[PDB]
Amino acid sequence: ARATAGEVEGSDALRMDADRAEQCVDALNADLANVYVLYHQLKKHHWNVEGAEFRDLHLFLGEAAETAEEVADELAERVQALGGVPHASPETLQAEASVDVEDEDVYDIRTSLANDMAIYGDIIEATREHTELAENLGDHATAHMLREGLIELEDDAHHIEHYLEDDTLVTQGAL
């Protein structure tokens, strides 16, 4: 093997010793696994959403899935740049994730979105914590990247909350 899962060597290019790096690496790898389960669940919901608002939600979820994937890509890359090994296989991702994932049945849109919302909220809190860890290790590139992904993820989370709110243009008359 060139590198072993779980090892972190730091980077001589980035002047980050393996001590410091391993702390960011652990945080990032946890985040990577959560965000890729997120990705996969947003894709599920995007594939299956049906009903009166489905096209708008299909588009929003497809976008949300794209932003998770990009976040995952930046996490994994940064793990690798810091001398670590990002979690790669799908069973590894889901094993290492802490967030809850739906079973294989398809649920109605309100249920599915409320499940997503819970994943986002967990990722959001973790990411906040990890940006502080990064800044306190003086890894400002990591901290900045994490915040750049945070703000995207909060925006999608906030979208889902709004989708779920108790207002609508529909009236009992229109029914």
CB of 158 to Mg ion, least distance (A): 6
Adjacent-strand bridge partners of 16: 11
Nearest CA-CA partner of 125 in 96, 95, 157: 157
Does position 66 interact with Fe ion (CB under 5 A)? The reply is no
Cα–Cα nearest to 148, from 163, 162, 130: 130
- Residue 60, both tokens: 């929003």
- For Na ion, the binding residue among 5, 52, 88, 151 (CB under 5 A) is 52
Q: Are 124 and 154 in contact (CB under 8 A)?
A: yes
- Chain positions 24 to 63 lying near Mg ion, rule: CB under 5 A, are 50
Among residue numbers 101 through 160, which ones bind its own copies (CB under 8 A)?
101-110, 113, 117, 120-122, 124-125, 127-128, 131-132, 138-141, 143-148, 150-151, 154-155, 157-160
Q: Of Mg ion, Fe ion, Na ion, none, which one sits near residue 52, judging by CB under 5 to 8 A according to partner kind?
A: Na ion
The reply, when asked if residue 73 is annotated as ligand binding, is yes
CA dist 34 and 126 (Å) reads 10
Shortest Å distance, C-beta 98 to Mg ion: 26
Does 46 carry a binding-site annotation? yes
Q: b/e string for 97-127 if b means 16 or more Cβ within 10 A? A: bebeeeeeeeeebeebbebbbebbbbbeebb
CB of 52 to Mg ion, least distance (A): 13
Task: Give CA–CA dist 136/34, Å, rounded.
Answer: 23
CB distance 109 to 51 below 8 Å = yes
- What DSSP character marks residue 56? H
Which lies closer to Na ion via its Cβ, residue 51 or residue 105? 51
Site string for Fe ion, 26-65 (x = CB under 5 A): ------------------------------------x---
* Pick 19 or 164: Cβ nearer its own copies: 164
88 is a site residue for Na ion (CB under 5 A): no
Query: Which residues of the shown chain bind Fe ion in the complex (CB under 5 A)?
Result: 62, 73
Query: Which residues of the shown chain bind Na ion in the complex (CB under 5 A)?
Result: 52-53
